[model samples]
Target: LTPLTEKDYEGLKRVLRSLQAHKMAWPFLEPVDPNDAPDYYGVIKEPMDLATMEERVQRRYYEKLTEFVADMTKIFDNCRYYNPSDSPFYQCAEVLESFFVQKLKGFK
Candidate 1:
C-alpha cells in the first residue's frame, strides 16, 4: 500500500539538494558525514517532518482555495438577477457536491 514512487524519491532528492545548498546535511540523509559544516544551530532547529508537512500543506491549500471560491461566490450573488429560473449555478453546485460525497464514500 506504500505509494512511494521514483518520482516521489526524485522530488525528495531535489528538495534535499536545494535545502543542503543553503544548510547542513540532515542526519537522516548523512549521519556520519564530516564534510558537513559544523553549524551548531543547524540540527537544534528541526525541519518539518514529511507527515506533518503534508498534513499542514493539505490544510493550507484547501483553506486558500475555499476562501478564493467563497470570494468568487460574492460576484455570483451580486449578479443573481441575471440568473435564470432553471439556474445553472445550482446544477453545477449539486454536481460538485455529489463528486465530493462520492469521493468521501470511497475513502471509507
Candidate 2:
C-alpha cells in the first residue's frame, strides 16, 4: 500500500518541470532522456488507482529525480560550485530538496 496523494503528483510535476528547465538551459551540456521528460498534460486528467499511481510516480518521477539530482551533485562538486545560486544546477538541487521537505511535512 502506498501513502501517496494528489499533492504528491503535483510535487512530482514541479520537480519534473525544474529538471526539464535545467536540461533545456544547456541542451548540449546535459541531454535529457526522452522518457525522463514527462508530458503530464493528458495523463493527469484521468483518475488513477493507488497502485498505478504509485508505480508511475516511482518509475517516472522519483527515479528520474534521484538520477538527475545525483548527476547534478557530481557535476557541481567537480566544478566547485555546489551551492551557487546563479545556475540551474544549484537551483534544481534546492528545488528537489524543498520538494522532499514539503512531502515530509505533509506526511503527518
Candidate 3:
C-alpha cells in the first residue's frame, strides 16, 4: 500500500470528479445555508462540504488521508442524518461515500 498521506490528494481528486457532477450533489456544493435550508444548521450537528474539503486538500498538510475521508463521510452522514431516507440526498451522498472509500483504497 502506498503512503496514505501521499496518496490522499490524488485519491480525493478522483472522488471529487464524480461527486461534483452527481445529480444530488448540488445540495452539498457548499455548506448548508441558513436561508436555503432553514433550521438546517441545527440538524447538521457538524457541517462540512466539498468546497471546504477541496480547500483542505489544496493545503497538503493533513496528518492522514483519513482526515479527508472523515470529512467526506461526515458530509455524507450529515445528509443521512437530515434526510433519514434513501430517497435522494442520502442515497446520492451514499454513492459519493462509496466512491470516496473505493478511490482512497487505490481507486477502482
- TM-score per prediction, in order, is 0.25, 0.27, 0.76
Indicate whether candidate 2 or candidate 3 has the larger lDDT.
3
Clashing pairs in 3: none
Candidate maximizing lDDT: 3
Ordered by lDDT, highest first, the candidates read 3, 2, 1
Worst 10 residues of 2 by lDDT: 41-50
Every candidate's lDDT: 0.35, 0.42, 0.74
> Could you tell me the lDDT of residue 57 within candidate 3?
70
Which ranges of candidate 3 are over 4 A from the true structure? 1-8
Better of 2 and 3 by TM-score: 3
Q: Which ranges in model 1 have alpha carbons more than 4 Å from their true place?
A: 1-85
Clashes of each: 0, 0, 0
Candidate 2 Cα outliers beyond 4 Å, as residue runs: 1-6, 22-24, 27-58, 61-71, 78-108
Q: For residues 1-108, what per-residue lDDT tens digits would candidate 2 score against the true structure?
A: 344456755665564444444433232133333364355223333322223333455565444345434443443342223234766655654554555445534443
lDDT of 1 by residue, 1-108 (tens): 334344544443444244333222232222223353244234333322223333433344323334323432332332233334476543443444344334434432
Query: Can you list the residue pairs that collide in candidate 1?
Result: none
TM-score winner between 1 and 3, please give it: 3
